[PDB]
């Protein structure tokens, strides 16, 4: 419970991130990290004060402000696509516990041609496993997506759901072996067989998609490919 | 400096666990922390923590988790601070994988209609992508009935072509001999 922001973004190379991190611990040291494979965190800036920065382990092509106690910002100037990554900040008391904020998705890219919403299906129980099994398996599938930013949840009879639910731990890619390759997503909800053949019974797969904000530019001969929800839907049966 | 171990492990759930975090200088305090893929940071341990895992230092510091659950599978690092203020120097992080203990097994692979569905096999068994550049296929999740206490795995293949056919879905993977194919 330290904060960040904007959850996620989608930028032309060249183009200015501004990425903002608050914390109400009263900490005075923050930090701001970048994460992925197959380096771990990386630090970039940090402060042991208001109105002061250090330089990072990597604090090129990344600038920091720490206007307050409270607020710690990172700015990507000239945007490239190595600095595609996660970014965490962090807070910390010198000498106790350090907390990280929930992070920022960031995506960097030549042009915003490549990005893709998900479109997405959702997939009946087999009559052989209810017969079988007494149980009921629905999957869905999110195809297509561009970049990889999507949660996924269920909605059962409109209120979301947890136990029977399993998600993959991340996307697949279309063509695994290339560049601007785009992603895919399945995940299963087991319910007992008296409850899929409720008629009445209504289940919704929603992918909350991380893609373009209102602010870009678009010329392509299509929706925007925006921040956005995309769903799939059933009811019982039988 | 920071070195943690193993480098990665699965258990049955149930199992105690214990991972380990080997510091080269003398240290001042030293944090755990624990992540899924996708999820965020968060610290587990600067000692106890509710409980149900713990910690012992001797520099090697090491982290006990008690039986073990499913939800317990994600990424755990350790990070050491030399200092009240000195910047935290992060371990490699080990990776853990719960895996259910699944009485009946049940190995079956059905066909749903708007997909193949691989499913209830008991935890030995490992699922492999295919050679085959235009068919889908997911690693084996475990979904956790938590209201009839049921648990069981599964994994999906799928592609738009008409050759593919739910009884050659899982050719690359090893599947149990028994494995049940409806008509």
């Known amino acids: 419970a330290v904060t960040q922001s904007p959850r996620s973004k989608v930028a032309v190379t060249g183009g200015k991130v501004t990425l903002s991190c608050h914390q109400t611990?009263?900490?005075?040291?923050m930090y701001w990290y970048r994460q992925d494979t197959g380096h771990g965190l990386r630090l970039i800036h940090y402060?042991?004060?208001?109105?002061?920065?250090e330089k990072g382990d990597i604090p090129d092509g990344y600038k920091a402000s720490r206007p307050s106690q409270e607020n710690f910002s990172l700015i990507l100037e000239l945007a490239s696509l190595s600095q595609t990554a996660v970014y965490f900040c962090?807070?910390?008391?010198?000498?106790?516990?350090?907390?990280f904020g929930p992070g920022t998705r960031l995506t960097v890219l030549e042009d915003l041609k490549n990005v893709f919403p998900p479109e997405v299906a959702v997939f009946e129980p087999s009559e052989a496993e209810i017969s079988h099994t007494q149980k009921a398996t629905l999957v869905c599938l999110a195809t297509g997506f561009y970049p990889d930013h999507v949660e996924l949840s269920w909605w059962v009879n409109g209120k979301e759901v947890h136990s029977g639910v399993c998600t993959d731990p991340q996307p697949l890619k279309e063509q695994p072996a290339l560049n601007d390759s785009r992603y895919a997503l399945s995940s299963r909800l087991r319910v007992s067989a008296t409850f899929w053949q409720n008629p009445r019974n209504h289940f919704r797969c929603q992918v909350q998609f991380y893609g373009l904000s209102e602010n870009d530019e678009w010329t392509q001969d299509r929706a925007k490919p925006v921040t956005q929800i995309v769903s799939a839907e059933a009811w019982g049966r039988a | 400096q920071v070195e943690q171990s193993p480098a990665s492990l699965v258990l049955q759930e149930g199992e105690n666990a214990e991972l380990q975090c080997t510091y080269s200088?003398?240290?001042?305090?030293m944090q755990w922390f624990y992540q899924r893929p996708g999820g965020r940071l968060v610290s587990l341990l600067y000692e106890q923590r509710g409980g149900r895992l713990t910690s012992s230092a001797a520099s090697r510091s090491s982290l006990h988790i008690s039986s073990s659950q499913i939800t317990d599978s994600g990424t755990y690092l350790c990070?050491?601070?030399?200092?009240?203020?000195?910047?935290?120097?992060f371990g490699q992080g080990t990776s853990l994988s719960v895996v259910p203990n699944i009485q009946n097994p049940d190995p079956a692979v059905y066909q749903l209609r708007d997909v193949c569905l691989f499913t209830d096999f008991d935890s030995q068994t490992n699922v492999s992508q295919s050679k085959d550049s235009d068919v889908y296929i997911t690693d084996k999740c475990v979904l956790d009935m938590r209201s009839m206490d049921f648990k069981s795995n599964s994994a999906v293949a799928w592609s738009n072509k008409s050759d593919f056919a739910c009884a050659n879905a899982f050719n690359n993977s090893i599947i149990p001999e028994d494995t049940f194919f409806p008509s």
């Open positions: 611990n009263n900490h005075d040291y």
């Open positions: 990070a050491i601070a030399s200092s009240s203020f000195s910047k935290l120097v």
């Open positions: 962090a807070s910390r008391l010198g000498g106790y516990e350090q907390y």
């Open positions: 200088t003398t240290l001042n305090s």
């Open positions: 402060s042991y004060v208001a109105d002061s920065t």
